[PDB]
Design an enzyme around this catalytic site. Structure first.
Site, PDB file in Angstrom:
ATOM      1  N   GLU A 178       0.829  -1.208   0.000  1.00  0.00           N
ATOM      2  CA  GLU A 178       0.000   0.000   0.000  1.00  0.00           C
ATOM      3  C   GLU A 178       0.861   1.255   0.000  1.00  0.00           C
ATOM      4  O   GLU A 178       0.583   2.190  -0.741  1.00  0.00           O
ATOM      5  CB  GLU A 178      -0.967   0.009   1.190  1.00  0.00           C
ATOM      6  CG  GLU A 178      -2.132  -0.994   1.069  1.00  0.00           C
ATOM      7  CD  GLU A 178      -3.142  -0.647  -0.035  1.00  0.00           C
ATOM      8  OE1 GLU A 178      -3.178   0.518  -0.489  1.00  0.00           O
ATOM      9  OE2 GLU A 178      -3.900  -1.550  -0.449  1.00  0.00           O
ATOM     10  N   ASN A 207      -7.463   9.394  -5.553  1.00  0.00           N
ATOM     11  CA  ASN A 207      -8.286   8.488  -6.363  1.00  0.00           C
ATOM     12  C   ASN A 207      -9.108   9.249  -7.402  1.00  0.00           C
ATOM     13  O   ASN A 207      -9.311  10.453  -7.263  1.00  0.00           O
ATOM     14  CB  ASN A 207      -9.198   7.658  -5.458  1.00  0.00           C
ATOM     15  CG  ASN A 207      -8.425   6.876  -4.404  1.00  0.00           C
ATOM     16  OD1 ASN A 207      -8.690   6.989  -3.205  1.00  0.00           O
ATOM     17  ND2 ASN A 207      -7.460   6.087  -4.847  1.00  0.00           N
ATOM     18  N   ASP A 232     -12.216   9.349  -8.021  1.00  0.00           N
ATOM     19  CA  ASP A 232     -13.421   9.932  -7.442  1.00  0.00           C
ATOM     20  C   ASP A 232     -13.147  11.189  -6.593  1.00  0.00           C
ATOM     21  O   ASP A 232     -14.072  11.759  -6.019  1.00  0.00           O
ATOM     22  CB  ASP A 232     -14.211   8.871  -6.648  1.00  0.00           C
ATOM     23  CG  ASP A 232     -13.579   8.526  -5.295  1.00  0.00           C
ATOM     24  OD1 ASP A 232     -12.389   8.810  -5.066  1.00  0.00           O
ATOM     25  OD2 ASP A 232     -14.287   7.956  -4.447  1.00  0.00           O
ATOM     26  N   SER A 257     -11.406  11.321  -3.787  1.00  0.00           N
ATOM     27  CA  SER A 257     -10.995  10.950  -2.446  1.00  0.00           C
ATOM     28  C   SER A 257      -9.491  10.675  -2.456  1.00  0.00           C
ATOM     29  O   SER A 257      -8.898  10.512  -3.518  1.00  0.00           O
ATOM     30  CB  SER A 257     -11.750   9.721  -1.967  1.00  0.00           C
ATOM     31  OG  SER A 257     -11.354   8.592  -2.717  1.00  0.00           O
ATOM     32  N   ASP A 310      -6.121   8.522  -0.417  1.00  0.00           N
ATOM     33  CA  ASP A 310      -5.665   7.469   0.499  1.00  0.00           C
ATOM     34  C   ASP A 310      -4.461   7.960   1.300  1.00  0.00           C
ATOM     35  O   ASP A 310      -3.571   8.598   0.754  1.00  0.00           O
ATOM     36  CB  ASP A 310      -5.258   6.218  -0.273  1.00  0.00           C
ATOM     37  CG  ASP A 310      -6.407   5.597  -1.055  1.00  0.00           C
ATOM     38  OD1 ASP A 310      -7.589   5.806  -0.725  1.00  0.00           O
ATOM     39  OD2 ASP A 310      -6.109   4.869  -2.012  1.00  0.00           O
ATOM     40  N   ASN A 344      -8.802   5.538   3.193  1.00  0.00           N
ATOM     41  CA  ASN A 344      -9.478   6.394   2.223  1.00  0.00           C
ATOM     42  C   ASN A 344     -10.394   7.449   2.855  1.00  0.00           C
ATOM     43  O   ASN A 344     -11.162   7.151   3.775  1.00  0.00           O
ATOM     44  CB  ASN A 344     -10.257   5.524   1.231  1.00  0.00           C
ATOM     45  CG  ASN A 344     -10.971   6.340   0.178  1.00  0.00           C
ATOM     46  OD1 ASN A 344     -12.166   6.551   0.277  1.00  0.00           O
ATOM     47  ND2 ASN A 344     -10.240   6.820  -0.820  1.00  0.00           N
ATOM     48  N   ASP A 383     -15.470  -4.281   9.325  1.00  0.00           N
ATOM     49  CA  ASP A 383     -16.553  -3.734   8.509  1.00  0.00           C
ATOM     50  C   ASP A 383     -17.463  -4.810   7.912  1.00  0.00           C
ATOM     51  O   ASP A 383     -18.617  -4.534   7.566  1.00  0.00           O
ATOM     52  CB  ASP A 383     -15.930  -2.919   7.370  1.00  0.00           C
ATOM     53  CG  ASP A 383     -16.890  -1.947   6.743  1.00  0.00           C
ATOM     54  OD1 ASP A 383     -17.798  -1.442   7.450  1.00  0.00           O
ATOM     55  OD2 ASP A 383     -16.726  -1.676   5.531  1.00  0.00           O
TER      56      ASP A 383
END
Length: 129
Positions: free
Chosen positions: A35, A46, A48, A50, A52, A59, A101
């Protein structure tokens, strides 16, 4: 801060990640490797809009507030910049929430593509726990 492999393993272990939700320590280290290359200051934007953040590339769409992701949730209740600290506590605590989650470590695309179903214990080999 750029962690050494064993240094990070040790810090993660101390923060309760070894076998957290059934994921051995090797999984978390592998995930961090791919990562962020063990760099707590890693950021990636990203498509969209957003972003990280940090060692585990958490995110802003869901987990932290960076004040620039419209309609973002802040489920870890932290500013995203807290994820960039050399102290990994905030990252770890948020990761625990993420992995609980329902989707486990599949939330981390690099874990799914690069760690999942591999010999992840190789990542903690040679380390004084």
């Amino acid at each position: 801060k750029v962690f050494g492999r064993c240094e990070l393993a040790a810090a993660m272990k101390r923060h309760g990640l070894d076998n957290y939700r059934g994921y051995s320590l090797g999984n978390w280290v592998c995930a961090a490797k791919f990562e962020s290359n063990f760099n707590t200051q890693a950021t990636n934007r990203n498509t969209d809009g957003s972003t990280d953040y940090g060692i585990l590339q958490i995110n802003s769409r869901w987990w932290c507030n960076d004040g620039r992701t419209p309609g973002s949730r802040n489920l870890c209740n932290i500013p995203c910049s807290a994820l960039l600290s050399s102290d990994i506590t905030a990252s770890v605590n948020c990761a625990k929430k993420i992995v609980s989650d329902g989707n486990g470590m599949n939330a981390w695309v690099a874990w799914r593509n690069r760690c999942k179903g591999t010999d992840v214990q190789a990542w903690i080999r040679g380390c004084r726990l």
